Amino acid sequence: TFEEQTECIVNTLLMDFLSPTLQVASFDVAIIAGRLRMLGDQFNGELEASAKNVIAETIKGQTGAILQDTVESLSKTWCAQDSSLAYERAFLAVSVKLLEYMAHIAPEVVGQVAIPMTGMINGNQAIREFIQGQGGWENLE
Structure with missing residues (x-):
């Protein structure tokens, strides 16, 4: 169900970026996506x-x-210059904001990133453990 929740969240985020009509016209994914x-907007680093x-x-x-190495590099950089920020929270923030920028800059191909990022988040124990330790997606932030 956690794996399926991650899939929905990454789909919702993407559909909201690509199509604001669908965001308006459409476990509450909308609040989580929010x-x-x-969280995503707290990242201001070069993308x-x-x-x-x-x-x-x-x-x-x-x-x-490349996707995992990119986010882990940007998150370590941001965690290096912000002691307060937990690595696992930085990771998610960068993942969202990178998905946002990739939709604006390349909306024809950004959709082919959804599955990889779903697999990345679901496949990473550190991030999975962190999210579930915050009471799952439902209670994250």
């Missing part, structure tokens, strides 16, 4: 370089490798 977006690389490998069909 809190992850509120142009990151987004382009993740998009480029996503076309080629090597999203998994």
Whole structure:
């Protein structure tokens, strides 16, 4: 169900970015999507370089490798310059804001990133353990 919840959340986030009509016209994913977006906007680091690389490998069909390394690099950088921020919270924040920038910059291909990011979040124990330790997606933020 956690794996299925992650899938819905990443789909909702993406559909809201791509189509605001669908956001308006449509376990409450809408509230969760809101809190992850509120969290996502706390990241102000440079994304142009990151987004382009993740998009480029996503076309080629090597999203998994570059996507995780990109978010882990940006999160370690942000955690290095902010002692208060937990790594696992930084990770999610970057994942959301990177998905946001990739939708604005490349809406024709951003959809091919949804499954990789779903697999990334569901596959990472540190992030899964963190979210479930906050009372699951339902109570995160």
